[PDB]
């Protein structure tokens, strides 16, 4: 679909970030 | 291939690597210029402050908007070369900007990155929008209170609605200042910049927001339950009472600072009211607190109570105050720049060389 819609969807999914 | 994330705040610059949970560097947004001109050409952050007595100290982002680009280039140069120990020509750079940033300023950020720092790619994101992304939302309203500025930002699917953005020139700096003024009643004399730093620490450790100010004032007048001790660097111990909730009360009652502004609660409501009725349910149900000044214990409940008094009776209000909200702008940037789906969003040098700085408008 739209590149912006895929971005929005991945932001809603969330992600783990590397602990520093 | 690490992207860099730079959050240029009115008070503190936060910098690090995309994919990381926290910035590698946090330093004051100050540039120091020698008064005598006779040894380094400029100093940035902690070093500028440690030599304050021989430098002309500059605050180029005092209220969230850059007022001096040379000072800004110096902050960026210090971020890359001294703080992160990176060559900016080797990394995509994600920069943050204040909401309602003038179109000319977005162009200067873009030009400086490609022309002065030779970045292979860059992107400019609104701070408040990054805070919403940090909480896993794409629609919502952000109350971002930092050091020199507070903004209320309604967001619909990643787009900050500019007609609905409101700004208050009231934040942490004003609260610290107010606290020094009110602490004189206890015979305390905080005047020097080093003493201003002690008071900022008292604010950050012992201040809170009262659920009902009038009631809280009665409690402190009737008992000693709210009195707290604080040990100064010298070793001397001081007591703080109603000043604990009187200083943050200025966010809700700007008249305490001698300001005619509406409080943070009414500003949030005014922003919601500037938006289409169809998305208001989504705004009230997603109120995201961001920035150091929203860190106060009790602030979320106070916002819930205040907003409930202004909102339609049938409206479900939800306040989201993550415990890491002091760095949520940075965290959102780290998430954004390390996402696979974001990789095609970057403004490349090739695109910039073809279009000039104006490309930021079409891309960011
Ligand atoms: N725990 C805390 N409680 C209250 N205020 C805080 C706390 N931590 C930081 N602050 C205040 O927040 C401000 C810095 O917040 P920040 O969002 O980083 O600002 P900016 O982006 O404008 O530089 C300062 O005025 C600081 O004293
Ligand atoms: Ca900020
Ligand atoms: Ca007022």
mmCIF file of C-alpha atoms and ligand atoms in Angstrom:
data_model
loop_
_atom_site.group_PDB
_atom_site.id
_atom_site.type_symbol
_atom_site.label_atom_id
_atom_site.label_comp_id
_atom_site.label_asym_id
_atom_site.label_seq_id
_atom_site.Cartn_x
_atom_site.Cartn_y
_atom_site.Cartn_z
ATOM 1 C CA UNK A 1 0.000 0.000 0.000
ATOM 2 C CA UNK A 2 1.025 3.681 0.573
ATOM 3 C CA UNK A 3 4.641 4.047 1.913
ATOM 4 C CA UNK A 4 3.292 6.437 4.619
ATOM 5 C CA UNK A 5 0.607 3.880 5.666
ATOM 6 C CA UNK A 6 3.265 1.165 6.072
ATOM 7 C CA UNK A 7 5.369 3.572 8.236
ATOM 8 C CA UNK A 8 2.283 4.455 10.383
ATOM 9 C CA UNK A 9 1.508 0.752 10.831
ATOM 10 C CA UNK A 10 5.120 -0.094 11.892
ATOM 11 C CA UNK A 11 5.105 2.817 14.407
ATOM 12 C CA UNK A 12 1.837 1.407 15.921
ATOM 13 C CA UNK A 13 3.454 -2.073 16.118
ATOM 14 C CA UNK A 14 6.383 -0.513 18.036
ATOM 15 C CA UNK A 15 9.865 -2.032 18.331
ATOM 16 C CA UNK A 16 12.550 -3.000 20.870
ATOM 17 C CA UNK A 17 15.493 -0.604 21.160
ATOM 18 C CA UNK A 18 19.094 -1.523 22.007
ATOM 19 C CA UNK A 19 19.893 -0.955 25.714
ATOM 20 C CA UNK A 20 22.964 1.270 26.148
ATOM 21 C CA UNK B 1 25.044 2.028 8.883
ATOM 22 C CA UNK B 2 23.792 3.935 11.968
ATOM 23 C CA UNK B 3 21.450 6.904 11.627
ATOM 24 C CA UNK B 4 21.997 9.812 14.066
ATOM 25 C CA UNK B 5 19.215 11.348 16.110
ATOM 26 C CA UNK B 6 19.550 14.938 17.274
ATOM 27 C CA UNK B 7 17.005 16.588 19.473
ATOM 28 C CA UNK B 8 17.866 20.285 19.775
ATOM 29 C CA UNK B 9 15.892 21.462 22.787
ATOM 30 C CA UNK B 10 15.555 25.007 24.118
ATOM 31 C CA UNK B 11 17.604 23.948 27.132
ATOM 32 C CA UNK B 12 19.267 20.594 26.447
ATOM 33 C CA UNK B 13 20.510 18.931 23.291
ATOM 34 C CA UNK B 14 19.943 15.144 23.271
ATOM 35 C CA UNK B 15 21.953 13.103 20.768
ATOM 36 C CA UNK B 16 22.640 9.531 19.882
ATOM 37 C CA UNK B 17 22.202 6.568 17.570
ATOM 38 C CA UNK B 18 18.921 5.387 16.004
ATOM 39 C CA UNK B 19 17.991 1.933 17.372
ATOM 40 C CA UNK B 20 19.287 2.827 20.873
ATOM 41 C CA UNK B 21 16.912 3.201 23.843
ATOM 42 C CA UNK B 22 18.543 6.442 25.093
ATOM 43 C CA UNK B 23 20.732 9.341 23.839
ATOM 44 C CA UNK B 24 24.516 8.919 24.274
ATOM 45 C CA UNK B 25 24.869 12.644 25.056
ATOM 46 C CA UNK B 26 22.722 15.252 26.882
ATOM 47 C CA UNK B 27 24.289 18.749 27.134
ATOM 48 C CA UNK B 28 23.014 22.397 27.579
ATOM 49 C CA UNK B 29 22.036 24.177 24.304
ATOM 50 C CA UNK B 30 24.565 26.999 24.942
ATOM 51 C CA UNK B 31 27.475 28.432 22.907
ATOM 52 C CA UNK B 32 30.210 30.432 24.671
ATOM 53 C CA UNK B 33 32.152 33.152 22.823
ATOM 54 C CA UNK B 34 35.336 34.745 24.347
ATOM 55 C CA UNK B 35 34.766 38.368 25.413
ATOM 56 C CA UNK B 36 38.433 39.499 24.867
ATOM 57 C CA UNK B 37 39.018 37.836 21.386
ATOM 58 C CA UNK B 38 42.757 37.096 21.896
ATOM 59 C CA UNK B 39 42.196 29.291 24.000
ATOM 60 C CA UNK B 40 39.421 28.252 21.517
ATOM 61 C CA UNK B 41 37.140 30.209 19.103
ATOM 62 C CA UNK B 42 33.932 28.920 20.823
ATOM 63 C CA UNK B 43 32.770 26.487 23.551
ATOM 64 C CA UNK B 44 29.572 24.371 23.536
ATOM 65 C CA UNK B 45 27.512 22.836 26.389
ATOM 66 C CA UNK B 46 29.110 21.848 29.743
ATOM 67 C CA UNK B 47 32.460 23.417 28.776
ATOM 68 C CA UNK B 48 30.760 26.770 27.870
ATOM 69 C CA UNK B 49 29.072 26.805 31.326
ATOM 70 C CA UNK B 50 32.313 25.890 33.178
ATOM 71 C CA UNK B 51 34.012 28.960 31.574
ATOM 72 C CA UNK B 52 30.867 31.269 31.897
ATOM 73 C CA UNK B 53 32.951 33.978 33.624
ATOM 74 C CA UNK B 54 35.110 34.579 30.508
ATOM 75 C CA UNK B 55 32.605 33.853 27.776
ATOM 76 C CA UNK B 56 29.566 35.567 26.274
ATOM 77 C CA UNK B 57 27.043 32.759 26.744
ATOM 78 C CA UNK B 58 24.549 32.264 23.897
ATOM 79 C CA UNK B 59 21.145 30.426 24.027
ATOM 80 C CA UNK B 60 20.388 30.103 20.241
ATOM 81 C CA UNK B 61 17.212 28.037 20.748
ATOM 82 C CA UNK B 62 15.971 29.850 23.947
ATOM 83 C CA UNK B 63 12.223 29.366 23.029
ATOM 84 C CA UNK B 64 12.428 26.341 20.665
ATOM 85 C CA UNK B 65 13.065 28.408 17.498
ATOM 86 C CA UNK B 66 16.685 29.030 16.340
ATOM 87 C CA UNK B 67 17.575 32.760 16.525
ATOM 88 C CA UNK B 68 21.281 32.297 15.483
ATOM 89 C CA UNK B 69 22.496 29.816 12.763
ATOM 90 C CA UNK B 70 26.240 30.127 13.417
ATOM 91 C CA UNK B 71 25.563 29.224 17.106
ATOM 92 C CA UNK B 72 23.404 26.358 15.789
ATOM 93 C CA UNK B 73 26.278 25.059 13.437
ATOM 94 C CA UNK B 74 28.663 25.166 16.466
ATOM 95 C CA UNK B 75 26.229 23.082 18.563
ATOM 96 C CA UNK B 76 25.905 20.566 15.671
ATOM 97 C CA UNK B 77 29.720 20.489 15.085
ATOM 98 C CA UNK B 78 30.239 19.809 18.858
ATOM 99 C CA UNK B 79 27.533 17.084 18.775
ATOM 100 C CA UNK B 80 29.231 15.169 15.884
ATOM 101 C CA UNK B 81 32.898 15.672 16.682
ATOM 102 C CA UNK B 82 32.966 15.917 20.488
ATOM 103 C CA UNK B 83 29.894 14.163 21.883
ATOM 104 C CA UNK B 84 29.160 11.274 19.469
ATOM 105 C CA UNK B 85 32.678 11.037 17.950
ATOM 106 C CA UNK B 86 31.247 10.623 14.413
ATOM 107 C CA UNK B 87 31.938 12.102 10.992
ATOM 108 C CA UNK B 88 28.464 13.438 9.832
ATOM 109 C CA UNK B 89 29.292 12.552 6.138
ATOM 110 C CA UNK B 90 29.047 8.869 7.161
ATOM 111 C CA UNK B 91 25.556 8.905 8.631
ATOM 112 C CA UNK B 92 21.931 9.792 7.781
ATOM 113 C CA UNK B 93 21.009 12.562 10.320
ATOM 114 C CA UNK B 94 17.532 12.905 11.874
ATOM 115 C CA UNK B 95 16.956 16.386 13.356
ATOM 116 C CA UNK B 96 14.067 17.519 15.478
ATOM 117 C CA UNK B 97 12.306 20.911 15.154
ATOM 118 C CA UNK B 98 9.794 22.852 17.182
ATOM 119 C CA UNK B 99 6.087 22.783 16.113
ATOM 120 C CA UNK B 100 5.193 25.803 13.875
ATOM 121 C CA UNK B 101 8.832 26.175 12.781
ATOM 122 C CA UNK B 102 9.132 28.946 10.049
ATOM 123 C CA UNK B 103 9.601 27.492 6.508
ATOM 124 C CA UNK B 104 12.925 29.428 6.187
ATOM 125 C CA UNK B 105 14.315 27.711 9.336
ATOM 126 C CA UNK B 106 13.521 24.195 8.004
ATOM 127 C CA UNK B 107 15.457 25.203 4.840
ATOM 128 C CA UNK B 108 18.504 26.421 6.908
ATOM 129 C CA UNK B 109 18.609 23.091 8.861
ATOM 130 C CA UNK B 110 18.530 21.228 5.474
ATOM 131 C CA UNK B 111 21.182 23.512 3.852
ATOM 132 C CA UNK B 112 23.571 23.381 6.885
ATOM 133 C CA UNK B 113 23.352 19.545 7.025
ATOM 134 C CA UNK B 114 24.126 19.042 3.307
ATOM 135 C CA UNK B 115 26.440 22.000 2.758
ATOM 136 C CA UNK B 116 28.336 22.438 6.027
ATOM 137 C CA UNK B 117 28.249 18.812 7.295
ATOM 138 C CA UNK B 118 28.054 16.959 3.974
ATOM 139 C CA UNK B 119 25.465 14.483 5.322
ATOM 140 C CA UNK B 120 24.626 11.647 2.850
ATOM 141 C CA UNK B 121 20.942 11.956 3.951
ATOM 142 C CA UNK B 122 18.743 13.849 6.402
ATOM 143 C CA UNK B 123 15.221 14.331 7.748
ATOM 144 C CA UNK B 124 13.463 16.969 9.957
ATOM 145 C CA UNK B 125 10.707 15.744 12.309
ATOM 146 C CA UNK B 126 8.441 17.771 14.705
ATOM 147 C CA UNK B 127 9.397 17.021 18.346
ATOM 148 C CA UNK B 128 5.773 16.476 19.507
ATOM 149 C CA UNK B 129 5.073 14.051 16.640
ATOM 150 C CA UNK B 130 8.153 12.003 17.702
ATOM 151 C CA UNK B 131 6.781 11.845 21.304
ATOM 152 C CA UNK B 132 3.447 10.448 20.005
ATOM 153 C CA UNK B 133 5.444 7.780 17.953
ATOM 154 C CA UNK B 134 7.428 6.817 21.158
ATOM 155 C CA UNK B 135 4.034 5.837 22.778
ATOM 156 C CA UNK B 136 3.071 3.722 19.723
ATOM 157 C CA UNK B 137 0.404 6.175 18.410
ATOM 158 C CA UNK B 138 -0.071 7.979 15.048
ATOM 159 C CA UNK B 139 -3.193 10.030 16.073
ATOM 160 C CA UNK B 140 -3.375 12.015 19.327
ATOM 161 C CA UNK B 141 -2.584 15.315 21.061
ATOM 162 C CA UNK B 142 0.742 16.104 22.631
ATOM 163 C CA UNK B 143 1.368 18.484 25.541
ATOM 164 C CA UNK B 144 5.138 19.085 25.204
ATOM 165 C CA UNK B 145 6.656 21.128 28.023
ATOM 166 C CA UNK B 146 10.439 21.601 27.971
ATOM 167 C CA UNK B 147 12.745 24.318 29.219
ATOM 168 C CA UNK B 148 11.827 27.547 27.396
ATOM 169 C CA UNK B 149 8.571 26.576 25.630
ATOM 170 C CA UNK B 150 5.329 24.531 25.938
ATOM 171 C CA UNK B 151 3.277 23.377 22.918
ATOM 172 C CA UNK B 152 -0.109 21.566 22.523
ATOM 173 C CA UNK B 153 0.034 19.632 19.228
ATOM 174 C CA UNK B 154 -2.972 17.778 17.733
ATOM 175 C CA UNK B 155 -1.726 15.032 15.345
ATOM 176 C CA UNK B 156 -3.736 13.068 12.787
ATOM 177 C CA UNK B 157 -1.954 10.075 11.219
ATOM 178 C CA UNK B 158 1.529 11.535 11.650
ATOM 179 C CA UNK B 159 0.517 15.014 10.469
ATOM 180 C CA UNK B 160 0.691 17.812 13.073
ATOM 181 C CA UNK B 161 -2.366 20.042 12.340
ATOM 182 C CA UNK B 162 -0.751 23.547 12.170
ATOM 183 C CA UNK B 163 -3.966 25.662 12.413
ATOM 184 C CA UNK B 164 -4.612 23.811 15.767
ATOM 185 C CA UNK B 165 -1.051 24.155 17.265
ATOM 186 C CA UNK B 166 -0.735 26.427 20.303
ATOM 187 C CA UNK B 167 2.399 27.731 21.988
ATOM 188 C CA UNK B 168 2.964 29.060 25.563
ATOM 189 C CA UNK B 169 6.290 30.790 26.405
ATOM 190 C CA UNK B 170 6.117 29.194 29.891
ATOM 191 C CA UNK B 171 8.035 26.058 30.893
ATOM 192 C CA UNK B 172 10.814 24.707 33.214
ATOM 193 C CA UNK B 173 13.021 27.844 33.092
ATOM 194 C CA UNK B 174 10.052 29.958 34.380
ATOM 195 C CA UNK B 175 9.208 27.433 37.135
ATOM 196 C CA UNK B 176 12.861 27.352 38.417
ATOM 197 C CA UNK B 177 12.795 31.166 38.320
ATOM 198 C CA UNK B 178 9.480 31.298 40.192
ATOM 199 C CA UNK B 179 10.784 28.834 42.832
ATOM 200 C CA UNK B 180 13.859 31.117 43.541
ATOM 201 C CA UNK B 181 11.432 34.077 43.978
ATOM 202 C CA UNK B 182 9.067 32.161 46.379
ATOM 203 C CA UNK B 183 12.012 30.607 48.355
ATOM 204 C CA UNK B 184 13.004 34.174 49.516
ATOM 205 C CA UNK B 185 10.027 33.965 52.015
ATOM 206 C CA UNK B 186 12.102 31.345 53.913
ATOM 207 C CA UNK B 187 15.059 33.776 54.075
ATOM 208 C CA UNK B 188 16.790 31.753 51.334
ATOM 209 C CA UNK B 189 18.811 33.818 48.883
ATOM 210 C CA UNK B 190 19.192 31.984 45.580
ATOM 211 C CA UNK B 191 20.483 34.518 43.046
ATOM 212 C CA UNK B 192 23.728 33.297 41.376
ATOM 213 C CA UNK B 193 23.525 31.024 38.289
ATOM 214 C CA UNK B 194 25.097 28.180 40.410
ATOM 215 C CA UNK B 195 22.318 28.781 43.011
ATOM 216 C CA UNK B 196 19.770 28.790 40.079
ATOM 217 C CA UNK B 197 21.152 25.253 39.354
ATOM 218 C CA UNK B 198 20.516 24.134 42.996
ATOM 219 C CA UNK B 199 16.869 25.396 42.812
ATOM 220 C CA UNK B 200 16.378 23.548 39.476
ATOM 221 C CA UNK B 201 17.493 20.396 41.376
ATOM 222 C CA UNK B 202 14.983 21.098 44.230
ATOM 223 C CA UNK B 203 12.283 21.596 41.574
ATOM 224 C CA UNK B 204 13.201 18.246 39.913
ATOM 225 C CA UNK B 205 13.285 16.278 43.209
ATOM 226 C CA UNK B 206 10.653 17.789 45.547
ATOM 227 C CA UNK B 207 8.157 19.679 43.381
ATOM 228 C CA UNK B 208 4.733 18.206 42.446
ATOM 229 C CA UNK B 209 1.334 19.260 41.050
ATOM 230 C CA UNK B 210 -1.564 19.511 43.568
ATOM 231 C CA UNK B 211 -4.855 17.808 42.584
ATOM 232 C CA UNK B 212 -6.720 20.714 44.225
ATOM 233 C CA UNK B 213 -4.438 23.734 44.813
ATOM 234 C CA UNK B 214 -6.865 25.513 47.241
ATOM 235 C CA UNK B 215 -7.158 22.292 49.371
ATOM 236 C CA UNK B 216 -3.373 21.622 49.203
ATOM 237 C CA UNK B 217 -2.634 25.239 50.372
ATOM 238 C CA UNK B 218 -4.997 24.629 53.398
ATOM 239 C CA UNK B 219 -3.181 21.289 54.232
ATOM 240 C CA UNK B 220 0.320 22.993 54.194
ATOM 241 C CA UNK B 221 -1.101 25.876 56.324
ATOM 242 C CA UNK B 222 -2.769 23.441 58.766
ATOM 243 C CA UNK B 223 0.114 20.884 59.111
ATOM 244 C CA UNK B 224 3.821 19.989 58.450
ATOM 245 C CA UNK B 225 2.955 16.821 56.403
ATOM 246 C CA UNK B 226 4.121 18.413 53.113
ATOM 247 C CA UNK B 227 7.442 19.880 54.454
ATOM 248 C CA UNK B 228 10.539 18.228 52.861
ATOM 249 C CA UNK B 229 14.260 18.505 53.629
ATOM 250 C CA UNK B 230 16.983 19.236 51.092
ATOM 251 C CA UNK B 231 20.733 19.096 51.593
ATOM 252 C CA UNK B 232 22.684 21.841 49.776
ATOM 253 C CA UNK B 233 26.187 21.097 48.238
ATOM 254 C CA UNK B 234 27.967 23.023 51.106
ATOM 255 C CA UNK B 235 26.363 20.596 53.601
ATOM 256 C CA UNK B 236 23.624 22.967 54.906
ATOM 257 C CA UNK B 237 20.031 21.569 55.106
ATOM 258 C CA UNK B 238 16.913 23.612 54.045
ATOM 259 C CA UNK B 239 13.116 22.984 54.314
ATOM 260 C CA UNK B 240 10.509 23.479 51.512
ATOM 261 C CA UNK B 241 6.718 23.506 52.121
ATOM 262 C CA UNK B 242 3.921 24.879 49.897
ATOM 263 C CA UNK B 243 6.590 25.999 47.354
ATOM 264 C CA UNK B 244 6.613 22.289 46.297
ATOM 265 C CA UNK B 245 3.241 22.634 44.552
ATOM 266 C CA UNK B 246 3.061 26.507 44.145
ATOM 267 C CA UNK B 247 5.871 26.576 41.524
ATOM 268 C CA UNK B 248 4.232 23.883 39.226
ATOM 269 C CA UNK B 249 0.816 25.554 39.829
ATOM 270 C CA UNK B 250 2.068 28.365 37.510
ATOM 271 C CA UNK B 251 1.543 25.873 34.563
ATOM 272 C CA UNK B 252 -2.201 25.936 35.331
ATOM 273 C CA UNK B 253 -2.223 29.552 36.623
ATOM 274 C CA UNK B 254 0.198 31.681 34.521
ATOM 275 C CA UNK B 255 -0.918 34.825 36.536
ATOM 276 C CA UNK B 256 1.442 33.576 39.328
ATOM 277 C CA UNK B 257 4.265 34.527 36.829
ATOM 278 C CA UNK B 258 2.419 37.738 35.876
ATOM 279 C CA UNK B 259 1.298 36.232 32.519
ATOM 280 C CA UNK B 260 -2.116 36.707 30.861
ATOM 281 C CA UNK B 261 -1.853 33.249 29.141
ATOM 282 C CA UNK B 262 -4.409 30.451 29.609
ATOM 283 C CA UNK B 263 -2.993 27.489 31.648
ATOM 284 C CA UNK B 264 -1.731 24.210 30.149
ATOM 285 C CA UNK B 265 -5.155 22.550 30.585
ATOM 286 C CA UNK B 266 -7.114 25.319 28.725
ATOM 287 C CA UNK B 267 -4.431 25.446 25.991
ATOM 288 C CA UNK B 268 -4.875 21.647 25.395
ATOM 289 C CA UNK B 269 -8.680 22.236 25.224
ATOM 290 C CA UNK B 270 -8.263 25.242 22.841
ATOM 291 C CA UNK B 271 -6.128 23.004 20.505
ATOM 292 C CA UNK B 272 -8.768 20.207 20.527
ATOM 293 C CA UNK B 273 -11.447 22.829 19.708
ATOM 294 C CA UNK B 274 -9.499 24.055 16.640
ATOM 295 C CA UNK B 275 -9.813 20.490 15.194
ATOM 296 C CA UNK B 276 -12.700 18.852 13.376
ATOM 297 C CA UNK B 277 -15.345 17.456 15.745
ATOM 298 C CA UNK B 278 -14.865 13.907 14.157
ATOM 299 C CA UNK B 279 -11.349 13.434 15.576
ATOM 300 C CA UNK B 280 -11.881 15.039 19.079
ATOM 301 C CA UNK B 281 -12.753 11.683 20.627
ATOM 302 C CA UNK B 282 -9.303 10.494 19.285
ATOM 303 C CA UNK B 283 -7.583 13.581 20.755
ATOM 304 C CA UNK B 284 -9.192 13.416 24.259
ATOM 305 C CA UNK B 285 -8.557 9.625 24.331
ATOM 306 C CA UNK B 286 -4.854 10.079 23.445
ATOM 307 C CA UNK B 287 -3.430 12.999 25.508
ATOM 308 C CA UNK B 288 0.340 12.412 25.527
ATOM 309 C CA UNK B 289 2.533 14.242 28.046
ATOM 310 C CA UNK B 290 6.061 14.981 26.856
ATOM 311 C CA UNK B 291 9.179 16.796 28.062
ATOM 312 C CA UNK B 292 10.935 17.423 31.363
ATOM 313 C CA UNK B 293 8.395 19.913 32.688
ATOM 314 C CA UNK B 294 5.571 17.246 32.469
ATOM 315 C CA UNK B 295 7.659 15.013 34.817
ATOM 316 C CA UNK B 296 5.967 16.445 37.934
ATOM 317 C CA UNK B 297 4.256 13.867 40.186
ATOM 318 C CA UNK B 298 0.470 14.576 40.149
ATOM 319 C CA UNK B 299 0.463 16.351 36.701
ATOM 320 C CA UNK B 300 -1.417 13.536 34.859
ATOM 321 C CA UNK B 301 -4.268 13.390 37.452
ATOM 322 C CA UNK B 302 -4.492 17.204 37.485
ATOM 323 C CA UNK B 303 -4.713 17.259 33.647
ATOM 324 C CA UNK B 304 -7.390 14.474 33.803
ATOM 325 C CA UNK B 305 -9.440 16.524 36.354
ATOM 326 C CA UNK B 306 -8.987 19.856 34.487
ATOM 327 C CA UNK B 307 -9.755 18.375 31.038
ATOM 328 C CA UNK B 308 -12.843 16.522 32.454
ATOM 329 C CA UNK B 309 -14.248 19.901 33.660
ATOM 330 C CA UNK B 310 -13.936 21.397 30.105
ATOM 331 C CA UNK B 311 -14.803 18.318 27.926
ATOM 332 C CA UNK B 312 -18.329 17.116 26.862
ATOM 333 C CA UNK B 313 -19.758 15.000 29.734
ATOM 334 C CA UNK B 314 -19.951 11.901 27.486
ATOM 335 C CA UNK B 315 -16.217 12.147 26.459
ATOM 336 C CA UNK B 316 -13.645 9.505 27.516
ATOM 337 C CA UNK B 317 -10.370 11.366 28.400
ATOM 338 C CA UNK B 318 -7.090 9.416 28.623
ATOM 339 C CA UNK B 319 -3.761 10.948 29.828
ATOM 340 C CA UNK B 320 -0.574 9.093 28.740
ATOM 341 C CA UNK B 321 2.463 10.159 30.783
ATOM 342 C CA UNK B 322 5.255 7.558 30.121
ATOM 343 C CA UNK B 323 7.957 7.501 32.905
ATOM 344 C CA UNK B 324 10.599 8.178 30.215
ATOM 345 C CA UNK B 325 8.724 11.301 28.854
ATOM 346 C CA UNK B 326 11.816 13.498 29.546
ATOM 347 C CA UNK B 327 13.477 11.682 26.488
ATOM 348 C CA UNK B 328 10.363 10.620 24.471
ATOM 349 C CA UNK B 329 11.123 13.141 21.616
ATOM 350 C CA UNK B 330 14.563 11.519 21.286
ATOM 351 C CA UNK B 331 13.149 7.915 21.690
ATOM 352 C CA UNK B 332 10.540 8.571 18.951
ATOM 353 C CA UNK B 333 13.369 9.774 16.664
ATOM 354 C CA UNK B 334 15.426 6.654 17.466
ATOM 355 C CA UNK B 335 12.356 4.492 16.572
ATOM 356 C CA UNK B 336 11.574 6.527 13.438
ATOM 357 C CA UNK B 337 15.108 6.589 11.924
ATOM 358 C CA UNK B 338 15.760 2.825 12.670
ATOM 359 C CA UNK B 339 12.482 1.641 11.069
ATOM 360 C CA UNK B 340 12.761 -0.285 7.741
ATOM 361 C CA UNK B 341 9.675 1.528 6.445
ATOM 362 C CA UNK B 342 11.316 4.922 7.097
ATOM 363 C CA UNK B 343 14.436 4.221 4.928
ATOM 364 C CA UNK B 344 12.771 5.647 1.720
ATOM 365 C CA UNK B 345 11.650 8.843 3.582
ATOM 366 C CA UNK B 346 15.220 10.293 4.037
ATOM 367 C CA UNK B 347 16.218 13.273 1.891
ATOM 368 C CA UNK B 348 19.335 12.120 0.058
ATOM 369 C CA UNK B 349 22.197 14.468 -1.037
ATOM 370 C CA UNK B 350 21.406 13.535 -4.697
ATOM 371 C CA UNK B 351 17.782 14.845 -4.197
ATOM 372 C CA UNK B 352 19.079 17.973 -2.416
ATOM 373 C CA UNK B 353 21.720 18.769 -5.095
ATOM 374 C CA UNK B 354 18.904 18.670 -7.694
ATOM 375 C CA UNK B 355 16.268 20.699 -5.694
ATOM 376 C CA UNK B 356 18.024 22.864 -3.089
ATOM 377 C CA UNK B 357 16.774 23.357 0.534
ATOM 378 C CA UNK B 358 13.083 23.778 -0.574
ATOM 379 C CA UNK B 359 12.989 19.910 -0.846
ATOM 380 C CA UNK B 360 12.364 19.694 2.995
ATOM 381 C CA UNK B 361 8.811 21.116 2.441
ATOM 382 C CA UNK B 362 7.793 18.346 -0.049
ATOM 383 C CA UNK B 363 9.606 15.617 2.001
ATOM 384 C CA UNK B 364 9.331 16.497 5.735
HETATM 385 N N1 LIG C 1 11.832 15.294 37.107
HETATM 386 C C1 LIG C 1 11.591 16.542 36.702
HETATM 387 N N2 LIG C 1 10.552 17.220 37.251
HETATM 388 C C2 LIG C 1 10.298 18.468 36.829
HETATM 389 N N3 LIG C 1 10.950 19.190 35.910
HETATM 390 C C3 LIG C 1 11.976 18.494 35.388
HETATM 391 C C4 LIG C 1 12.349 17.198 35.712
HETATM 392 N N4 LIG C 1 13.450 16.802 34.964
HETATM 393 C C5 LIG C 1 13.717 17.852 34.227
HETATM 394 N N5 LIG C 1 12.873 18.914 34.437
HETATM 395 C C6 LIG C 1 12.936 20.223 33.797
HETATM 396 O O1 LIG C 1 12.659 20.043 32.427
HETATM 397 C C7 LIG C 1 13.376 21.026 31.648
HETATM 398 C C8 LIG C 1 14.122 20.320 30.551
HETATM 399 O O2 LIG C 1 13.174 19.487 29.856
HETATM 400 P P1 LIG C 1 13.394 19.193 28.330
HETATM 401 O O3 LIG C 1 12.196 18.535 27.753
HETATM 402 O O4 LIG C 1 14.640 18.322 28.159
HETATM 403 O O5 LIG C 1 13.644 20.596 27.601
HETATM 404 P P2 LIG C 1 14.047 21.189 26.171
HETATM 405 O O6 LIG C 1 13.794 20.210 25.108
HETATM 406 O O7 LIG C 1 13.190 22.458 25.956
HETATM 407 O O8 LIG C 1 15.547 21.522 26.191
HETATM 408 C C9 LIG C 1 14.240 21.814 32.631
HETATM 409 O O9 LIG C 1 13.646 23.081 32.895
HETATM 410 C C10 LIG C 1 14.311 20.885 33.847
HETATM 411 O O10 LIG C 1 14.551 21.535 35.087
HETATM 412 CA CA1 LIG C 2 12.291 19.546 23.615
HETATM 413 CA CA1 LIG C 3 -3.536 33.046 34.066
#
